[PDB]
Amino acid sequence: EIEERYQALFSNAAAVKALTQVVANSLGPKGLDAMLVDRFGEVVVTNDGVTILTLMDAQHPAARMVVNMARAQEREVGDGTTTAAVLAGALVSEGVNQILKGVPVSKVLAGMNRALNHALFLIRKNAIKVGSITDDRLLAAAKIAGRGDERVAAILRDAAAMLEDKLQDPGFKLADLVLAKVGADTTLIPGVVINKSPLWEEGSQKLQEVRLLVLDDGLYPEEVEEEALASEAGFEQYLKNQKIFQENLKKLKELGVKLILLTRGISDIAEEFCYENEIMVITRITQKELKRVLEFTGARAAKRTSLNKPVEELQKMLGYARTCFYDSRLDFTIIEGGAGKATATVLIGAATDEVVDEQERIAKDAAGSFAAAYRSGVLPGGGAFFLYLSREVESLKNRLPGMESYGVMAFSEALKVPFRVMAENAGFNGLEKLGDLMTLQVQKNNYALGLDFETGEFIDMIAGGVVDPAEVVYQAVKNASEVAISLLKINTII
Amino acid sequence: EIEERYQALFSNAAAVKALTQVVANSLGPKGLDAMLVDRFGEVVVTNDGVTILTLMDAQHPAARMVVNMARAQEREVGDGTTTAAVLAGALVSEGVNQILKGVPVSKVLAGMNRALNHALFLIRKNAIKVGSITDDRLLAAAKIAGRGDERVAAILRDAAAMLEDKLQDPGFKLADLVLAKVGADTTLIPGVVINKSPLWEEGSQKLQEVRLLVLDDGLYPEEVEEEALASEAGFEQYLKNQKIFQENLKKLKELGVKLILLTRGISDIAEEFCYENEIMVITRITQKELKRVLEFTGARAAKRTSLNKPVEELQKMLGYARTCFYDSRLDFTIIEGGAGKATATVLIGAATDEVVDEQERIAKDAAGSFAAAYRSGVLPGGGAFFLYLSREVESLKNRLPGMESYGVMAFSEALKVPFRVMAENAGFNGLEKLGDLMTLQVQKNNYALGLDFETGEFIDMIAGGVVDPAEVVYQAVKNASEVAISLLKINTII
Amino acid sequence: EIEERYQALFSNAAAVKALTQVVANSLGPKGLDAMLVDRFGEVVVTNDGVTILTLMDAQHPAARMVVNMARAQEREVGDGTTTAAVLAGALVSEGVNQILKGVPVSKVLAGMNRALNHALFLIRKNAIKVGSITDDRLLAAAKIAGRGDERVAAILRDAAAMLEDKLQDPGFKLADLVLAKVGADTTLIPGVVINKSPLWEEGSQKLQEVRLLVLDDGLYPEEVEEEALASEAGFEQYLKNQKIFQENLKKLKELGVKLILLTRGISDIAEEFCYENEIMVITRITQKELKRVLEFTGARAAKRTSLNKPVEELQKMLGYARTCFYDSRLDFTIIEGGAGKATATVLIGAATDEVVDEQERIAKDAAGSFAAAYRSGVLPGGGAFFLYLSREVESLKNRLPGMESYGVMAFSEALKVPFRVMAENAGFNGLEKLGDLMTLQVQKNNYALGLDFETGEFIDMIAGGVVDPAEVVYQAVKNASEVAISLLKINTII
Numbered sequence A, B, C: 001e002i003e004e005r006y007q008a009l010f011s012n013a014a015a016v017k018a019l020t021q022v023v024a025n026s027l028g029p030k031g032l033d034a035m036l037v038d039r040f041g042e043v044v045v046t047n048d049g050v051t052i053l054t055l056m057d058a059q060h061p062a063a064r065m066v067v068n069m070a071r072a073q074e075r076e077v078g079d080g081t082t083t084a085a086v087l088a089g090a091l092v093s094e095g096v097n098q099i100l101k102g103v104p105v106s107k108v109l110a111g112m113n114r115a116l117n118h119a120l121f122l123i124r125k126n127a128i129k130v131g132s133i134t135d136d137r138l139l140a141a142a143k144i145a146g147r148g149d150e151r152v153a154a155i156l157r158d159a160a161a162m163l164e165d166k167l168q169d170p171g172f173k174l175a176d177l178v179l180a181k182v183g184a185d186t187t188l189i190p191g192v193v194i195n196k197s198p199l200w201e202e203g204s205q206k207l208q209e210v211r212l213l214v215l216d217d218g219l220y221p222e223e224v225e226e227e228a229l230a231s232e233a234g235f236e237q238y239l240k241n242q243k244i245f246q247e248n249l250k251k252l253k254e255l256g257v258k259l260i261l262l263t264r265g266i267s268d269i270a271e272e273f274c275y276e277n278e279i280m281v282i283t284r285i286t287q288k289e290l291k292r293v294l295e296f297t298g299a300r301a302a303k304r305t306s307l308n309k310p311v312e313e314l315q316k317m318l319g320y321a322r323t324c325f326y327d328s329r330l331d332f333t334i335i336e337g338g339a340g341k342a343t344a345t346v347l348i349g350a351a352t353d354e355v356v357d358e359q360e361r362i363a364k365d366a367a368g369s370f371a372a373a374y375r376s377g378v379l380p381g382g383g384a385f386f387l388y389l390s391r392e393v394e395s396l397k398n399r400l401p402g403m404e405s406y407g408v409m410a411f412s413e414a415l416k417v418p419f420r421v422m423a424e425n426a427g428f429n430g431l432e433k434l435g436d437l438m439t440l441q442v443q444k445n446n447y448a449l450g451l452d453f454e455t456g457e458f459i460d461m462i463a464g465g466v467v468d469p470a471e472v473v474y475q476a477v478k479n480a481s482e483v484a485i486s487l488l489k490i491n492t493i494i
C-alpha cells in the first residue's frame, strides 16, 4: 500500500525505456533498424534514428518531453541526435535505480548537476581545436556524416576552404552550398546555380557584363477585381495597363538590362518583347534560389508593381553579375562574378530523382559536421570520449560528501552506455569490449582509444578517421542531461 | 454501526490530504515539479504551487474550499501561498487525530481558536521592524522572494529610497513600476516610460517644455452610420466633420504642442499635419502607461469631443513634463520632470521575448515583498519561525484546562509540518533534522536558526539573507487556520 | 523453458540472503535481537550472532554450508564470526547481481580471487604491529571484546606481561589462564589455583616447600571383581592388597609429602592415614586443572600401578611448588612458586553460579582477542577499514582487463556492507553515512575514521579505543571469501 508515492516516477520510466530500447537498435555504424506501422497499414523501415524519433506512435507525456528535446537537437546538428536521445533515456532509467534504493530525489539531482557541469567543463578543455583548414580530421568529420565517399568530403572541404573567412559568420550555413542534379559529374562551381532552362533555347549560351533584375513574382500586368471586367471602365483600366506594361518594357531596355529572373510564368507580350531585345530570361526559380542570387548579385527583390519607378530608381534595384552561362549539355544555369557576397555551389551527381534528394541531405550533415568541426573543435568518436568522461566523473564520488555522491556515480556509469550499445549492435559482448577498452584507456593514458565495429580490433579513432565536432557532443550532453533532470523533477500525475 | 456517524469527515479528510500531498512537493527552494493532465490529454509541468492548484480536477467540496482560500490569498498577498496551503492541510490532518482519539469536535475547535489568537499575538509582538529603509535585510527580503537577482534588489532599493514617501500610502503597490524589454539593461529610471518608437524616427531625440495632450482614443475624423452615408447628406456631413477636424488641428497648433499620445490610430491627414508642425506623436500605448503619464505630468485625460473646448480651457487640460527623450538605439521613450507627484520606473533586461513576460513575475514577487517589508515586519524564513511558534503554543498545554487543552496541542504540532516537508524535500531525514533543530533553537535561544536546505548545516536565516515579510505570514496563518476551522466544523453531507 | 538453467542459483541465493538478512540485524554495538523457536514452543532471544547461527532452523543446503563456515571460524578464532557471516552473504547477493546483469560466472570468480589476494595483502601490510606489549591499543583490543570491564583488560595485560615469552607456543591457549569465581575479587595470582575446599577445614591455612604427588585417579586400594568375591582366594588377595595399600601409605609418609591431588574418590583407610600425617588433600579436580598443574609443578601423572615403584621413581614423580595456601573465607586453594612451566591465573568476580559461567565466556574471548592482538597487531574496527579496502580494491577496476573487472567491483562494494548495516542498526540513514564517511576518509587520508554508533559523530577508531586484531580480520575475510567462492560455483540441483 506504499506504491503510490513512487507510482508516477515508474510510470514515466517504463515509458522512456520503452522508447530508447527501440532507438538503441539503430545506434552506431552497425546499428539495426525499425519498422513503423500506421493504422492504415502503411509501412516504413528506417535505420536512421531521427526518423523513428519522429514517426513512432508514442502518446506518453514523457516520451513527448523527450521528442521535443530531439527536435531541439536536430535544429543544431543533423548528426548525433540519436546519441543525446539514448543518453537521455539511459540517464533516466539507470538514474532512478539509485533513487529507488533509498537516495532522495533532490539530493540525487544535486549531485547530477555537479556531474553535468563538470562534464561540460572538461569537454571545453578537451575540445581539440584545429588551427588549420587542411587537416584530415575535418575531412573525416565530413566523411562520417558523408557515409565515407571521400569525393564528397574533398569537394566540400575545398569549397569551405574557398570561403574560410565567412566560416566566422553565424549568418552562414555551409550546407547551403549544395545542389544535386541527376547524372551530373560531382564537382564545384565558383558561383551560384539555377537548375533550369532559359525561356527560349538555342544551345549552350553565354552573356557578359550582366545587368540583371530579379523578381519574387511573375511577369504579368496589373490586375483589378474580376467583376470589373463586366463594367467597361474596368476594361479601360485593362487597356491602359496593357499600355503601361510595354512602356515599362522600354523602361527596361533603357538601362541596358540583359537578363531577367522570375519565380512564376511570363506573359506572351513579355516573351515577344524579350525575343526582340536579345534579353535572356529564366522562370520558376526556388525562393531559396531567389535568396541566393539576390545575395550574390547584390540586387533587390522586386515584384510587378515596382515597375512604375522612373528609371532613376531602376539603377538601384539591379544586379551585376560579371558573367553568365547556360549549359544545354548539362541543362542548367551558372551565374558568376557577383558584386555582393561571394557564395559558391557544390554539385553532386545522382542516378534517379530518388537518390538526388538524399545526396543533398548527406551533404547537409557533412557540411554541418565540417562547420562545427572547424568552429568548435573535434573529440574522438566511437563513443570513446564518453569513457574518459565516465571515470573522471566517477572521481567525484569521494571528493565531495553528502548523498549527492550517489547521484554523481549514477551519472558516471550512465556515460558508459553508448559504446556498449554500439558494440552490442555490431555483435560484440558489450561487457567484454567495454571493460577491456575502459581498462585499456587508463593503461595507455589515452582517451582516444576505441573500437572499429567491423574488425573487432581496437584502434585510435582519430587515426581511424572517426571524430565528432565539439559543439555537437557539447550541446548533446547539455540538452540530454537537462531533460533528464527535468524529467526526474516530476513527482505526480493528475 | 457507529462508523456512519463520522463518515463525512473522512470523505473530506481523505480528499484534502490527497490534495495537499501534492502541493507539499512544490514547497521550498528544492521543491519537486508536478505533471498535470486535462482530459483532452493536455499536459503541463509546474513547480510553483499556485499554478498547480488550478488545472487539478478537484470538484470535491473540501478541495474547492481550500482552492478558494489559496486563490483568495494570492489575491491579497502574492508570496507564501504554497506555505499557507500546506499549513491548512496539516491543521486538518493533524487536527482529526485528536477527534478520532476521543476529543470532541467543538472542544477541539475551541482550543484551536485560542492557539490561533496566541500565535497572532506572538507574530505581532516579535515582528522585527526595520528602522533603516536601506537595511540589507530588506534587500535580501526582495532577493529570496524575487529569485535573488542582485540587480533587481539594487534597483528596487534605489527606487524605495528615492521614493520612501509613498510607502505611507496604502493605496499604492510598488510592483507595477516594473516593465521589461528585450535585450535591455537592468537599471532605474526617474520617470515614466513607453517602450515603442514615435511616429517619425531617425535618431535619439529630446524635447524640453513638452506640451503634451493625452487621449483615450485615436486621431481620425468624426464617423457617421454606414446607412447614413447612403443619404447624400452623409457625404457632405463627412466633409463637415472633416472641416471641424481641420479646425481642431489648427486649434492644436495654436497652443505650442510638441507631443501627442494616443491609444489608437491616426488619420493620414492628421499625421501630415503633425509632420508639418514639428509635433511628436506616440500611438497605441498601454493603458497603464496612460494612467502613469497622466499622474506624472499632472495633465487630464481627454478625448476628441473635448476638442471643442475654446482653446483657453483647453490650455488647462494640457501637460508638462519638463523633459522628454526617445532613445532609438534602445527603442523606447522616457518622460521626466512632471509638475505633479514624482513617480519613477524600474527597467529590467531580457534575452528573448519568452523570458520577457516572466521577469515581471519575479519582479512582482520581489517588489511586493519589499513593499510588505517596509510596511512590516520581517521574520526568519525557511519555515523556521513556525517551530518557535509551535513550542510557544505547546506551553499552554497545562496552564489551561479542559479537553480544549488537547486541541491546542494538535495546533502546535501542525506548525512543525512546513519545516519537515522542506527537509524531506531537500532530501534530508525530516524527523531527524526537525529533532536536531528544535533542540538547537532552545540551546541557542534564537528563533532565527534554521537549516540551509542546500548545504545541510544550520544557520541564522537573517545572516543567510533569507527572510519573509511579517504581514504575509500573519494573514497566511490566519486564513489557513480559518479554512481549517470551517473544514473541521463539518459533520455530515446531503 | 530457458529459466531452468539458472534455477539452482536463485534456489541457494534466496536462502543465503535470507539468513544473513537475519544475522545482520544483530551485527554491531547497536544490533538487534531475534526470537528463535524450538518445536516444543521453546523461545529464545539472541543478540550474539553465533547463538543465532546455531539455533536457527535453516535446513537449506546453502545455509547449512554457511553454518559450516561459522563453525569453522569460531573454532579457530573466537571473535569476528558475525562479520564474516554478513560479509559472506553480501558477497553472495552482489555476486549474483552481475550474473543477472550478464557477467559469465568463471570470468567473475577467477578475478574475485585476485580481489581476495590484494585484500589479504592489504590486511598484512597495514597491520599496525605493537612492539611494546604495554601499548594502550592492546588494552583496548581486550576492551572491545570485554564488554567494557577495564578491570579484566588490565589484569589480562599485566598477566600477559608476566608471560610475554610463552605467548609463542601455539600448543598453549592464554584464555585458559582465566577462571571466574562467585563472590571473588578481580585479581591476578602468580600461580595455579584450585577452587574447592579440601577434605580438611581448619580455617585459612598455609604450607610451604610442598613435596607433592599428582594422580589422575583416586586413593582406593586395588579393586577386584564383585564376582571374584566368590573365589575365596580373592578374599585373602583382597586382604593382602589392603596391606600393601597402607604399606605404600607409609612409603609416602617417608617422603615428606604434605599434599595430595586426586581425580576420584578416597578409601577410608587412606583417609584416616592422611588425617594422621598432617597431609592436606583435594579430590575430583578438572583435567584442565590436572594438565596445567602438571605443567606448573613439574610433577608427573600417576595411577594405581605406580605404587609398586621401588622407592626410586618417587623423587622424580613429585611436584614443587614452593608455597601453597588455602583460604576458607574465600573458599579456594593457591599454589605458587613452581619449578616447571610458568602459567599464572586470572580470577574474575561474579554474582551467582549463573553469571559465573557467562563471566568466563567474556574472559575467554577477551584473552583470545588480546592474544591475537599481540600476535599480529591491530586494524581499525567500526567496520571502518573495510571501506579503505573497498576503495583500494576498486582501484583495480580499470587496472585489469577482461570481462573480469566488473566482478572485482562486486567484491569492492561487498566490503562496504558491514558499516552500512552497523549504521542502519544504530538507526542512521546508511547511505547518507556512507556518502559522508567515504568522502571524509579520502580527503583526510586516514582509514581509521569511522562512526560512533551512539552519538552520530565521527571519530578515529584507534583513538576511540575500538579495534580488531589483525589475524582475526585476516582469516575472517579469508573464510567468508572462500565460502562465497565455493558457493557460486554451483550450477544445478538433483
Ligand SMILES: Nc1ncnc2c1ncn2[C@@H]1O[C@H](COP(=O)(O)OP(=O)(O)O)[C@@H](O)[C@H]1O
Pocket: A027, A028, A029, A049, A078, A079, A080, A081, A082, A083, A144, A145, A380, A381, A382, A383, A452, A453, A466, A467, A468
Ligand atoms: N563509421 C564509424 N566508425 C566508428 N564510429 C562511428 C561511425 N559512425 C558513427 N560512429 C559513432 O556513432 C556515434 C553516432 O554517430 P552519428 O554520425 O552522430 O550518428 P547519429 O547522428 O545517428 O548519432 C558517434 O559517437 C560516432 O563516434
Ligand SMILES: Nc1ncnc2c1ncn2[C@@H]1O[C@H](COP(=O)(O)OP(=O)(O)O)[C@@H](O)[C@H]1O
Pocket: B027, B028, B029, B048, B049, B050, B078, B079, B080, B081, B082, B083, B144, B145, B380, B381, B382, B383, B453, B461, B464, B466, B467, B468
Ligand atoms: N533559500 C532559502 N533559504 C531559506 N528559506 C527559504 C529559501 N527559499 C525558500 N525558503 C522558505 O520556503 C518558503 C518558500 O515558499 P514560498 O515563497 O512561500 O512559495 P510561494 O511563493 O509559491 O508561496 C518560504 O516560506 C521561505 O521561508
Ligand SMILES: Nc1ncnc2c1ncn2[C@@H]1O[C@H](COP(=O)(O)OP(=O)(O)O)[C@@H](O)[C@H]1O
Pocket: C027, C028, C029, C048, C049, C050, C078, C079, C080, C081, C082, C083, C084, C380, C381, C382, C383, C451, C452, C453, C466, C467, C468
Ligand atoms: N562502541 C563501539 N564503537 C565503535 N565500533 C564498535 C563498538 N562496538 C562494536 N564496534 C564494532 O562492531 C563490530 C562488532 O562485531 P564483532 O564483535 O566482530 O561480532 P562477532 O565478533 O560476533 O563477529 C566490530 O567490528 C567493532 O569494531
